[PDB]
Symmetry: C4
Subunit: 232 residues, 4 copies
């Protein structure tokens, strides 16, 4: 005879503000900060995710490359739905924070630095779709998970990519719902949806225009194989 207890659940709205959260991540973390830390984070980010989901423990500090950043492991499933606080980091919260932090550099800084950084940061989700750095800073960066916290700065690319994928059938449409709960230049989506449909409609156009060749196999092996029936 074991005793299990449950408690009422309150009803309010969400307090976690991506803007505070980022401005609160900027000082507390990234004292150093190396582009080589971000580079590590992002190219091993799929590995980084698989570990945290194996490990059953819910504060994990990660060292990459020499940069120590501790992330509430909400991946490890069950998480277990242990609330992150509004001042909490997550592999996801972290990804987009960095994604925005890079774009603030890409804008703020000089040209010679802009050339060292684009040589240093790589986006495994972008460049799988053959989407490269010269396709624009905001668009490359918008492939990083968590860039949907910042449709503001990312010019509704994270959402447009999102539409474009669900549309072409390359992504289930569940993966679009976190995003539609978002905000754009301080506007809730019950308003930006009505009153901003263009930029959205406009960003989808740019995104539609891109390469988008899936790089499961080489360009030369694609055509070759097609001459046989196989399009992959």
């Amino acid at each position: 005879i074991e005793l299990e207890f449950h408690d009422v659940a309150a009803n309010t709205s969400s307090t976690f503000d991506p803007e505070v959260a980022y401005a609160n991540f900027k000082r507390v973390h990234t004292t150093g900060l190396s582009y080589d830390h971000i580079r590590i984070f992002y190219i091993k980010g799929r590995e980084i995710k698989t570990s945290l989901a194996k490990r059953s423990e819910w504060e994990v500090t990660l060292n990459l490359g020499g940069w120590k950043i501790t992330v509430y492991n909400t991946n490890f499933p069950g998480n277990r739905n242990s609330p992150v606080p509004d001042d909490g980091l997550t592999l996801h919260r972290l990804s987009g924070f960095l994604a925005r932090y890079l774009l603030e550099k890409m804008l703020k800084v000089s040209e010679p630095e802009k050339l060292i950084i684009k040589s240093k940061i790589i986006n495994p989700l972008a460049e799988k779709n053959g989407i490269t750095w010269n396709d624009g800073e905001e668009v490359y960066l918008s492939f990083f998970p968590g860039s949907e916290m910042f449709l503001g700065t990312f010019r509704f690319y994270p959402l447009a990519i999102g539409i474009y994928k669900v549309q072409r059938k390359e992504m289930e449409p569940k993966y679009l719902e976190k995003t539609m709960r978002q905000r754009y230049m301080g506007l809730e989506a019950a308003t930006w949806t009505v009153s901003k449909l263009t930029e959205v409609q406009s960003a989808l156009t740019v995104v539609s225009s891109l390469g988008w060749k899936k790089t499961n196999v080489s360009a030369a092996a694609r055509d070759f194989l097609a001459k046989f029936g196989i399009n992959m």
Copy 2:
């Protein structure tokens, strides 16, 4: 060389009577009883279910919010098919018992109490389908699992919802069979099916008339997204 034994299985019919069972749950349990206990039970009822299926042990007592009610854990799989007795409670047996017990209050009581209760009880399965309290007491309550033990009091809403879902394709039709074994005003289904087809046919109409907007995403994000192709 291990020895495993099996015993014959007898042939009779089912003795568990929802009416006795409820009238036997009314006194033994709910001395207090708070609407705040029921509220706890129902909004955490999905959690409550996931625990009992993790825990391997077959009498579990649950405390919600301060109300202690012990439930043969038939969820924990294998249950293991350890018979519940006719005087036994189950997450399911319990759900519908409460579901009926609320409706007895909704009927029995005053108007000012009827307004405090509807403010206090929430039905996560109803209100996911945007089905609200003002859609009628019996209909809201009929979304609670186990309301199919009481097609009598629930006016064949639990079954009509059931048809409507299987029909629209929103539910597999296996989930309709426990229900068709049921009884209606003391009548076995080999009779109520023949001789009651209207009320059934009648309740499906009411149910068909309802909102039924799936709330995976906001109303404003639905229309927005549709302008792009995505209906979700």
Copy 3:
């Protein structure tokens, strides 16, 4: 550095002869034997199977109801492909042995015994398809797994049922291959297939003629539900 060894594999044909095997099961086992042992075996045979697949150990003796019969547990997966010998019993080998042993009684014996036995033995796979004892001894018995070891005595019902299911789409066609390796009145299938196609074709007819109403739900709930769209 661990060392793992593998050995050549020889090439001959199969030595296990259902006829010897049965005639060797008849004396060694069933000294008693009760119809109440067989009844136990067959109605709990689905349970009996689920145990043996949980238990990791490969000689298991089962007691039903008071009859002790030890069965190389090839179910427990991996079995593990530990060869059964030609004098070995298996839940499957056992099922059909009994299936044939009953039919030898059904034939050999008197009428008053024939009425006690048909009242005592139940076939959970037959009677799910509403196929009953009066549909003929061979046909009812041919639903028992392992009756395909004896197409001879079972008059190519085990195979005809098999065709009929694959055909109607009620069974995957993998489940027909063990059977086509079989023999019929001493004839290998490369011969009975050519030269016996009628009886086969003939038994399918009988089998086609049967009830075959799937009893997932009552007959009265089927028609009722159909009046709504749902055929199950």
Copy 4:
């Protein structure tokens, strides 16, 4: 609070050269070597694979039949992506090494030896598709996994089989990508694809011409069953 570290990842190309690798496997291993070792390897190769994926440890030495050969267990999943070196063996690397090593014998040697070997080696993947030794040495051998390391010696049969399967729908097309990264007579695939399309196109023809009867069931049971509707 646990600390997990990740390190940058470099960018170059692949150094593992099937030609060196084979010529480095030829002396270091196969001092003896028996056709009876290869025979063991290949007919138990499916078993051999299932063990290595159960065992969690990453250097495994295998003894077959008396031939000891140690293979970095990359099967055991996660492998775990512990790099094999260019001088490393793998169940796969090993399979094709042997596959080529047999073909070097089939070519190098006399006729009476060529008749003992074809009697001794069996290819479980070939002969499931009823593809036999007399269908040519290169074609039989090209069914062995890892023969795609040597499109050179195997006359683009490993790839043609590959096309033919993806085409007929008998294989997912993911399983064609390792192969398209390969090389042919010293030529990278961005060149052999352009400039060799015939031999490829030519080898597909030969492969298309073959039996390819799936031997899930006997030839006599196929026709028999078809007379009933069932083609398997």
